[PDB]
Amino acid sequence: SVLLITELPEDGCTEEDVRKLFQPFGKVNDVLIVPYRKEAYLEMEFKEAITAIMKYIETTPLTIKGKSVKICVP
Numbered sequence: 001s002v003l004l005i006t007e008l009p010e011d012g013c014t015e016e017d018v019r020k021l022f023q024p025f026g027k028v029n030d031v032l033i034v035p036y037r038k039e040a041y042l043e044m045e046f047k048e049a050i051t052a053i054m055k056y057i058e059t060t061p062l063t064i065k066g067k068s069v070k071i072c073v074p
Contacts, residue, residue, distance in 0.1 A: 004072040
């Protein structure tokens with residue numbers, strides 16, 4: 001349901017940023033951003049987009065502003 005991405009760009013993280021990157025995978029409702037730790041929390045609508053994100057990362061890392069970020073599960 002909920003994903004965590006860490007190691008965000010030191011300058012260039014918005015709630016809209018994270019949405020744009022992950023929208024092609026599913027319906028994103030709530031996105032929560034805390035810049036103090038350079039991380040954010042996306043709340044995915046269905047559990048199937050989660051397996052879709054994860055199976056994609058085993059070959060190509062997701063990149064925002066050119067920096068690849070690290071995705072973490074509960």
